[PDB]
Amino acid sequence: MDYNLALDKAIQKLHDEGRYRTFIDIEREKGAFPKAQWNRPDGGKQDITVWCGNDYLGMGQHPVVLAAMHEALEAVGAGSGGTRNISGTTAYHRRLEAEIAGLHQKEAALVFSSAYNANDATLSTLRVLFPGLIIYSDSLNHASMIEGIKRNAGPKRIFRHNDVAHLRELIAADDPAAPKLIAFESVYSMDGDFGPIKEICDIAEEFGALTYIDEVHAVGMYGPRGAGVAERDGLMHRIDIFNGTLAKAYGVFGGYIAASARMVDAVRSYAPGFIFSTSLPPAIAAGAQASIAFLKTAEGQKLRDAQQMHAKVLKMRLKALGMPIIDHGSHIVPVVIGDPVHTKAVSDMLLSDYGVYVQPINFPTVPRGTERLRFTPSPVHDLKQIDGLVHAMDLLWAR
Amino acid sequence: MDYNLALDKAIQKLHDEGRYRTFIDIEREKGAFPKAQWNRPDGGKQDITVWCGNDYLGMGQHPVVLAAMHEALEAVGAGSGGTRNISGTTAYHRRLEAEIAGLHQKEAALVFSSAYNANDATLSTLRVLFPGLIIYSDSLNHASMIEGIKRNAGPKRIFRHNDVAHLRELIAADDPAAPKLIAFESVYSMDGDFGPIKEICDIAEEFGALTYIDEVHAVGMYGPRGAGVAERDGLMHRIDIFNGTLAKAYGVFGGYIAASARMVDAVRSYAPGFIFSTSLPPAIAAGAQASIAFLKTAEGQKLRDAQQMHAKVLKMRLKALGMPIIDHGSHIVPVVIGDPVHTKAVSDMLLSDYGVYVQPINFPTVPRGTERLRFTPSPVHDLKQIDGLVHAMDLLWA
Ligand SMILES: CC(C)(COP(=O)(O)OP(=O)(O)OC[C@H]1O[C@@H](n2cnc3c(N)ncnc32)[C@H](O)[C@@H]1OP(=O)(O)O)[C@@H](O)C(=O)NCCC(=O)NCCSC(=O)CCC(=O)O
Numbered sequence: 070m071d072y073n074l075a076l077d078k079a080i081q082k083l084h085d086e087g088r089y090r091t092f093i094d095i096e097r098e099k100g101a102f103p104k105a106q107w108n109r110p111d112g113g114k115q116d117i118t119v120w121c122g123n124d125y126l127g128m129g130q131h132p133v134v135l136a137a138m139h140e141a142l143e144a145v146g147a148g149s150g151g152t153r154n155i156s157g158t159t160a161y162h163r164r165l166e167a168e169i170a171g172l173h174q175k176e177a178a179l180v181f182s183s184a185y186n187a188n189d190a191t192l193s194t195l196r197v198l199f200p201g202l203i204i205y206s207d208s209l210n211h212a213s214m215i216e217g218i219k220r221n222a223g224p225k226r227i228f229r230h231n232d233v234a235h236l237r238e239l240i241a242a243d244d245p246a247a248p249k250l251i252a253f254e255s256v257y258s259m260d261g262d263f264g265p266i267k268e269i270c271d272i273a274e275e276f277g278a279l280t281y282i283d284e285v286h287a288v289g290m291y292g293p294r295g296a297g298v299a300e301r302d303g304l305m306h307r308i309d310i311f312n313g314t315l316a317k318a319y320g321v322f323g324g325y326i327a328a329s330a331r332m333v334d335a336v337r338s339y340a341p342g343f344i345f346s347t348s349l350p351p352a353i354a355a356g357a358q359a360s361i362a363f364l365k366t367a368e369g370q371k372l373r374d375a376q377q378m379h380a381k382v383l384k385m386r387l388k389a390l391g392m393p394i395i396d397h398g399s400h401i402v403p404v405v406i407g408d409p410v411h412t413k414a415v416s417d418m419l420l421s422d423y424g425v426y427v428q429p430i431n432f433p434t435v436p437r438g439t440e441r442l443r444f445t446p447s448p449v450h451d452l453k454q455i456d457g458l459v460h461a462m463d464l465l466w467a468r
Numbered sequence: 469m470d471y472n473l474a475l476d477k478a479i480q481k482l483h484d485e486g487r488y489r490t491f492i493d494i495e496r497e498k499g500a501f502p503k504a505q506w507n508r509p510d511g512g513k514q515d516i517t518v519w520c521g522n523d524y525l526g527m528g529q530h531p532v533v534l535a536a537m538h539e540a541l542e543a544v545g546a547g548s549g550g551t552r553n554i555s556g557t558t559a560y561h562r563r564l565e566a567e568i569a570g571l572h573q574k575e576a577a578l579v580f581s582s583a584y585n586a587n588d589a590t591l592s593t594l595r596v597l598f599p600g601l602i603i604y605s606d607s608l609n610h611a612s613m614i615e616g617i618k619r620n621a622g623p624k625r626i627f628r629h630n631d632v633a634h635l636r637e638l639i640a641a642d643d644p645a646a647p648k649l650i651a652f653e654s655v656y657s658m659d660g661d662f663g664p665i666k667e668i669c670d671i672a673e674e675f676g677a678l679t680y681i682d683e684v685h686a687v688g689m690y691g692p693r694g695a696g697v698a699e700r701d702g703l704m705h706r707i708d709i710f711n712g713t714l715a716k717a718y719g720v721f722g723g724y725i726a727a728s729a730r731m732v733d734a735v736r737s738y739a740p741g742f743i744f745s746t747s748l749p750p751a752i753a754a755g756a757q758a759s760i761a762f763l764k765t766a767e768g769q770k771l772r773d774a775q776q777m778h779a780k781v782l783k784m785r786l787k788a789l790g791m792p793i794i795d796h797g798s799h800i801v802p803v804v805i806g807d808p809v810h811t812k813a814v815s816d817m818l819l820s821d822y823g824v825y826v827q828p829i830n831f832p833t834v835p836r837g838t839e840r841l842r843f844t845p846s847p848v849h850d851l852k853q854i855d856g857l858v859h860a861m862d863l864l865w866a
């Protein structure tokens with residue numbers, strides 16, 4: 070039994086499918102987002118523009134976020150030094166959980182070291198709290214959701230993406246006494262489309278199911294207080310559990326769930342993924358809390374307005390260059406190439422020729438045959454930045 | 469169903485077993501560790517001494533760690549803004565990974581958002597890279613290891629804690645052509661005992677198995693450079709994969725594995741837990757890197773010598789007092805109470821009556837019937853401090 074052989078086989082398999090990923094070493098320039106320094110593999114340094122990042126509103130450089138972080142470092146040190154149970158519970162975590170509960174108008178919130186962990190731990194743990202739980206999952210749910218859903222044995226049903234008629238057909242066929250939970254996303258990361266929240270909620274109420282929504286690509290960005298798409302549509306009260314991140318629009322790190330005190334307490338008491346891990350550094354919690362708080366204000370709205378419009382302008386200018394990109398009406402702008410090697414070929418050209426950094430997206434992040442570039446215009450991608458990008462794209466494609 | 473009823477039943481169940489956990493809201497005072505402010509449930513504030521923390525060497529307040537963190541915040545901002553693939557790979561992560569690789573004298577290292585995630589992702593992904601892998605796991609392995617080992621379907625064998633005779637018996641009975649991996653800890657968090665690294669490595673070599681060691685409660689603290697117990701015993705070259713944390717003795721946050729470039733690249737390319745999650749904030753990576761680098765030096769050794777001795781003194785003083793204290797020769801000092809409700813009472817009294825904070829440890833962190841207090845003396849727990857605690861436990865006790 071030669072372990073190295075097997076490793077080589079597994080690696081070679083990636084190259085043969087043209088999906089081996091090469092990371093890009095960068096350093097974002099605080100105060101000058103979206104500018105970053107690219108550390109080229111040949112040791113050189115090049116100024117670049119980040120066009121595919123997930124700090125959607127540039128909160129990673131916001132002076133109020135950084136002030137809160139610098140203060141916390143000075144007050145309590147670098148980390149918490151423990152799990153939530155063994156000394157790692159700080160006022161910074163309580164405040165942050167209250168801030169999140171308030172955002173989603175829920176009794177409680179629970180903070181994990183990432184939205185990934187939150188989804189994985191919570192979905193799996195619910196199978197333990199609700200013996201016989203059947204989980205209905207949107208075919209394009211995120212990996213973390215799929216992972217949580219499968220982790221522990223138990224019934225799952227996958228419904229065709231956004232297909233509520235399929236959802237209802239599946240659920241009506243199931244044992245009417247079984248606990249049921251429907252898990253889906255408000256904004257899907259790669260297509261940039263919206264989940265039909267009202268219709269799913271309607272189905273959940275009709276069949277007595279819990280609803281679980283991942284608003285990871287929505288929080289900070291939609292709704293008058295940045296609480297997400299359900300807030301935008303006035304449906305937050307119809308959602309049982311919210312899952313969110315503090316690492317994207319909020320610009321820091323970590324994730325959470327928000328739900329009733331009963332739900333939060335059960336999860337925190339039973340989920341190994343919550344119990345057995347060091348709690349988030351107080352400075353992270355400080356920064357994230359400041360971010361959420363800020364984005365709840367009229368000043369936050371300004372950032373959302375600017376993002377919406379920059380996205381709208383970019384899409385307009387790209388279609389005008391004779392470029393069909395499917396515009397599902399969100400802030401995410403995907404350009405589908407449809408082959409992983411072309412996708413990297415094109416991404417290499419933007420990077421080197423133009424300083425436009427947009428990572429090539431392939432399997433398993435997107436289905437095979439749907440590989441793409443994924444632009445994420447933020448408030449800091451000003452009108453001239455946009456014009457810069459379109460002229461790059463035009464000049465590129467004129468090859 | 470009625471979902472609220474089931475939740476109540478699940479919560480009531482905790483109370484009935486006397487294991488419902490009440491968290492303690494604290495704020496450590498940077499520059500004055502182990503002092504912290506306890507935010508009492510009644511709104512009051514009280515000065516306390518942390519005695520159960522995992523920032524084992526007080527690196528959480530170290531000026532070089534904090535300097536690097538402040539610097540990074542100013543250079544690149546609050547977070548990375550992406551997954552490792554989508555813009556989240558920074559020079560700070562590369563440097564950190566190299567720093568860790570060097571620590572364990574391995575070709576490569578891979579950083580996850582926690583040692584938990586590292587264990588869970590790696591152990592499960594290994595089943596995918598080595599079809600038919602049989603994993604042999606110490607009965608007292610950490611939850612994260614257990615979670616990783618069972619995540620994907622596949623053979624597992626649990627050996628009685630530290631029992632190498634049992635390990636060998638199990639492994640000799642299995643198909644001799646199957647890929648095998650043995651997974652164990654160098655220091656077990658709750659007993660404070662040591663894994664028999666040499667004997668396990670010997671078995672591994674004899675039966676052609678990979679060795680996977682979790683040194684989470686050892687890195688920064690054992691070996692001349694703080695690389696752990698395998699470094700201490702000159703066994704680092706016989707270990708295939710190391711798992712470690714940046715959140716305990718290193719004083720920051722996050723975890724990692726260290727192994728060959730091949731091993732790291734395979735895991736990185738196949739593990740959903742690595743792929744689909746935002747990368748560690750550059751400031752966290754900056755701080756951790758500074759921490760490891762510092763603890764590699766003679767000045768780091770000073771902190772280890774101080775910790776070892778404070779631990780030695782505390783155990784001596786507690787035996788002297790007649791406490792029920794298990795001593796397996798590590799820096800962890802467990803006092804077994806053996807009942808989750810009395811463990812809470814003793815702990816509650818200690819806090820509100822004497823400003824001593826030592827969380828009651830119950831199931832599922834430790835087996836039922838073995839609930840306990842777990843003292844973690846650090847270099848900042850000076851001789852006066854120790855004197856303070858012993859006097860308090862004596863007065864208790866009564
Ligand atoms: C290949 C597929 C399409 C599904 O087939 P697999 O390759 O997993 O085959 P397999 O693992 O043997 O089969 C999948 C197992 O998981 C289950 N499964 C598959 N899809 C599911 C869904 N939507 N909901 C619930 N369960 C699902 C199957 O029933 C099966 O479980 P059983 O066998 O037990 O029945 C999946 O891997 C995938 O495409 N995932 C996409 C992940 C995603 O959406 N990522 C968003 C990226 S956003 C991001 O963070 C970017 C990241 C980056 O690149 O940096």
Ligand SMILES: CC(C)(COP(=O)(O)OP(=O)(O)OC[C@H]1O[C@@H](n2cnc3c(N)ncnc32)[C@H](O)[C@@H]1OP(=O)(O)O)[C@@H](O)C(=O)NCCC(=O)NCCSC(=O)CCC(=O)O
Nearest residue numbers: 152154155345605606607608609610611657832833834835
């Ligand atoms: C009593 C135990 C040992 C667990 O007893 P359980 O009854 O839960 O075990 P179980 O029901 O058998 O668990 C179910 C599945 O897990 C498997 N399983 C159990 N132990 C295993 C091991 N060592 N390796 C691999 N698999 C294992 C079983 O085979 C089983 O599958 P089958 O039954 O189908 O065979 C307790 O000590 C525990 O689980 N502790 C968690 C790990 C730990 O030591 N954590 C301390 C971390 S210190 C920390 O992080 C601090 C934290 C804090 O408190 O905040």
Ligand SMILES: Cc1ncc(COP(=O)(O)O)c(C=O)c1O
Nearest residue numbers: 183184185211258285314745746
């Ligand atoms: C829908 C969804 N949920 C969760 C995650 C992971 O979030 P986090 O960075 O907080 O681990 C991703 C982001 O990559 C995602 O696309």
Ligand SMILES: *Cc1c(COP(=O)(O)O)cnc(C)c1O
Nearest residue numbers: 346347582583584610684713723
């Ligand atoms: C606490 C613990 C972990 C988790 O480490 P984090 O970095 O805090 O996730 C992993 N292994 C062991 C043995 C632990 O005690």
